[PDB]
Homo-oligomer: 307 residues x 4
């Protein structure tokens, strides 16, 4: 519900650890979750982009939902990735997730590849929002799906009693407009780690983050500074935060974040194809920029076992 997520500032879009053979590494999940909870993750998004959801089956996502719920144990609210570019598929899966329970919301992305019109988007998100007991957060990211929801269509959907938020990845101008004209019980999150400083100053509710995996402390430091009216401290952190964010996306995410987490000893493992791990040369630089670590010594993307 909205009330469940209301106070969340740093929602982490959780990676999916994989074994070398391509199967999910469930054994690695507890250590990673505890790391997040020890580093100011106050909410967790499962089966998002960062989780490599395109390469996960719906049934694998349900197993992941179970594995994480067991560890988290109601300590922080959870959001489930439920939407695809197929409205029927999204409807059936959100029903399964609502039935499975334990989630504060379902995340549904603006459909990718098929490039729907504003009206298509409207009917897509209305159908998902109508489908179950689980409230919906809209994921708007033209950088990944080409098309984008206009703020006009967004606010029309925001009026739905079962749509309670947006993970907005467009412009700060758009961000400001949504904050200004938002209805009640509707949350506005940025999905852009580099913009979080600006988004929070603008009046956003938080960030749905990749960088909170590895830089949770300094993000909290920055957010605390903003909230405690120490703008000089917040800006200083932000200026130093930007190149770290940039490094985390200097190869297709979540390859960079997985490389750092592997270095930290968290067995994030490789990426599932079509994604490949970051090249060794990039890994050394990435680790140096993001966490100030010294990394030592072709890449292979993996496949979900066909047996």
């Amino acid at each position: 519900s909205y009330q469940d997520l209301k106070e969340c500032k740093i929602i982490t879009a959780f990676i999916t650890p994989f074994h070398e053979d391509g199967s999910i590494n469930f054994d690695a999940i507890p250590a990673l979750i505890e790391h997040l909870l020890a580093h100011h993750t106050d909410g967790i998004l499962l089966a998002g982009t960062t989780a490599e959801s395109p390469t996960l089956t719906h049934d694998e996502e349900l197993e992941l939902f179970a594995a994480v719920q067991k560890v988290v144990n109601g300590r922080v609210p959870l959001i489930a990735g439920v939407g695809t570019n197929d409205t029927r598929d999204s409807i059936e899966f959100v029903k399964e997730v609502a039935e499975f329970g334990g989630f504060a919301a379902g995340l549904a992305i603006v459909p990718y590849y098929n490039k729907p019109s504003q009206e298509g988007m409207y009917q897509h998100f209305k159908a998902i929002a109508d489908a179950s007991d689980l409230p919906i957060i809209i994921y708007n990211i033209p950088g990944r799906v080409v098309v984008e929801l206009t703020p006009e269509t967004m606010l029309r959907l925001a009026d739905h009693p079962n749509i309670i938020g947006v993970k907005e990845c467009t412009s700060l101008a758009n961000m400001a407009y949504l904050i200004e004209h938002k209805p009640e019980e509707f949350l506005i999150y940025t999905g852009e780690d580099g913009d979080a400083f600006h988004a929070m100053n603008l009046g956003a509710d938080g960030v749905i983050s990749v960088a909170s995996h590895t830089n949770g402390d300094e993000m909290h430091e920055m957010f605390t500074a903003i909230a405690e009216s120490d703008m000089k401290k917040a800006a200083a952190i932000q200026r130093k935060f930007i190149p770290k964010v940039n490094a985390l996306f200097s190869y297709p995410s979540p390859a960079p974040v997985k490389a750092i987490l592997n270095y930290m000893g968290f067995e994030a493992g490789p990426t599932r194809l079509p994604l490949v791990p970051a090249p060794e040369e990039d890994v050394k630089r990435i680790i140096k920029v993001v966490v100030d670590g010294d990394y030592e010594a072709t890449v292979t993307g993996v496949l979900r076992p066909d047996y």
Copy 2:
């Protein structure tokens, strides 16, 4: 095989007709196919973007492949859409399609949403090409998938004995480079109807088309004129052809092409959500521009039956 598709000039990316309830209209297929074959379609791509493949299940696509093969009866070669943004899913389906048989090639798109690197794309396509007997045509379209295969990576993949073509939707500069440096047994298609004229002049092998549904004759007249060294006639058709192509994409495809086909009486039906049919105001304009027709008059996207 390459030999099967060698002489193709106009390959139609066939729509999927839907009933008003959301199920596939198999009844309407025989009439639509015969229409294409009577209007200079010399090859058919099934389960492409125009077919609304992202809203079709793999099982539904197999059912479509069966229905079309029964009607076509080997008259023209067929290409099956096999690729998704999930390499494992793509491997399993291309193996199913190869076993099903009766296809000249399989089309695999550059992965959408997850935005893989060049090395990601390479391993993705290599795995699909390694997977079965069915040769692969790569589908390169940054306009839908954000990322794109560079000509270098493209030509690396072209050297694979089981990769025999590309459906290129980038620029004419890229097309020229590819045509220049192509290996043997490799077909270069444009996936953009508005570029078909320039691509053919440049030395391309043909077009995988939406416009062939409704404007097959004038496309054939243009191509014939290019082949018979009547460039003035070719250019004349091209200059009048462009606003027709523009109309076909003035609402998210395949909405406009379905509208025209419905007007022509082929029961293409509505689109599946997240795509909605073209608005009534657009429908009249589109028909007037594309087929010089007079159309006599909220839209509803439909869903695959959950039963």
Copy 3:
């Protein structure tokens, strides 16, 4: 000097009022200047983009510099627009301006139309900075000049003892990097009114503004709120400020700002060709959005007298 401009927060890029015959309206200058100074303009840029400098002769600009200095009377520091896309022209004019005197700095834009390389830009700005006693503020705006100074080249130029600032119109990511790595005696201004809020929070020195003409008070209220740690008030003003900024650029600037100033009764007059005044339909909308005013009603761009 740097010291003269150090404490500036809102620097207005002053318009050039024109008579209906195309000559400069020097009569209207005294009233417009006093208006700016009574509405929290703490510095004035003369002969900038907003002044329609490309349609002014160098001799006319000297006449403007004289008229403004007489009225201002040293109350606020002044910046002279000195740079064109011709390095020699720029050298000769900055030497004239330095000899004329009474300016805190000279503004030199990144050359337009000819699209120089980074090394071209470097030598361009170095020559202008070497040319005279007048320190230089670089004007970086790819939105008008296509090309842009990279932060690296920008910071190379910043090390020049006679380059003391930048008017940055790129992104907030670039702004942050520049603020972080700035040398001593170097001012960082945003030239984008809609970014002023985020730039100030990020640590920028101020704004060189169009909006200050008509909305100086609320900009000062916003800046004061940023300075007094009242971020909620600041963000509130910002969110309402953005559609006002958008209106000011809804027709090629300075057409919209001149329309408002004419409505306010300052005889800003028309624009010089190739710029035309804002259309009557736009004028009413713009005034309503920007200054909440009720406007009671072919446009004509005017020419500098050939006599």
Copy 4:
């Protein structure tokens, strides 16, 4: 007049040779003109972009006009660059050029930097077209001036009795529309060397070229092949022509073309600031790609003498 330029296929946008001290090298002009005339230049544009006109004074342009007219001696028609981003300046200069005589047309670019609206553009070009006896060709290039003329505004201007052409640098879709709906006695040239093949196939009148300086023969070869219905030959040349064009713009033009012309022994000299000569490393590659030459062994842009 239109009749003067009607049969022109390859119009060369002539460079301006400079001495090391920054002054125009008039001594170098005769050799270059003869080279052009010996290599299928059938018309010459003076004081265009390639001429580095932004760095030339109007009085220098008149001297260049005289120097070239003396050498050419009516052998080929000439077009003069007369337009700036200042309508009054453009009006006064076209009057001087019409009075000076010897030109078939004046070229006027869409105003740069000030980003006028369609109406501003209309009134700008109407004023220039109204000003003198010399007919006008519109230069539409958003790549250099940001803004662009819509085909609608272009064709409105095309109806002016004293506007007889366009140097179009947008898209081939736009190119086709203009060719289709052109009025009588109106010429359509591409200003994009890489597009010339496509433009000519589409029905354009010719190219206003940079590459004709160094690759005049193969362009003529290509154009002859198109005109003689040998499309295979024309395409083969085009595919090999593209990387040569690309090399000619791999550093800000006309630096690359000047480097090749200096290698050919034509004393093109350096570029005037803000443009700098191509770096030695680029020069070696450029010469190899464009003219298959082997080049042997910081850069300095020059300034027009201030004495």
